[PDB]
């Protein structure tokens, strides 16, 4: 027997969840560089990301949107409103990370302006 599999062992393929990947991060580059190190096990039994490993991926995350499902579908925390479905879909990229998460904020929160005439003050 010569041939034999390689070792598809990784956390995003490349490489598994390690510093590298926050790195990028610049701010939570700290954070992650100790954290990983806490988090041995890291991985399921099945080589699935256990919930440590979601958690992490949630806090160095790239520009991406991911659900409490753990996957990035697109509609999971917009489904709640209804008709703002349609805002949140556009903006909720933009509170991605870091820069422009505060400024995404400010547009959702005029989402939900009340522009409702005042509860009777008896």
Known sequence: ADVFDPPTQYGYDGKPLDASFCRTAGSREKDCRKDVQACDKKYDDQGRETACAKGIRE????????????????????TLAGIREVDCRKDAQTCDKK????????????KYKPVVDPNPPA
């Open 59 to 78: 806090k160095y995350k790239p520009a991406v949107v991911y659900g409490y499902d753990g996957k990035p579908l697109d509609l999971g925390f917009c």
């Open 99 to 110: 820069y422009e998460s505060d400024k995404c904020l400010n547009a959702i929160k005029e």
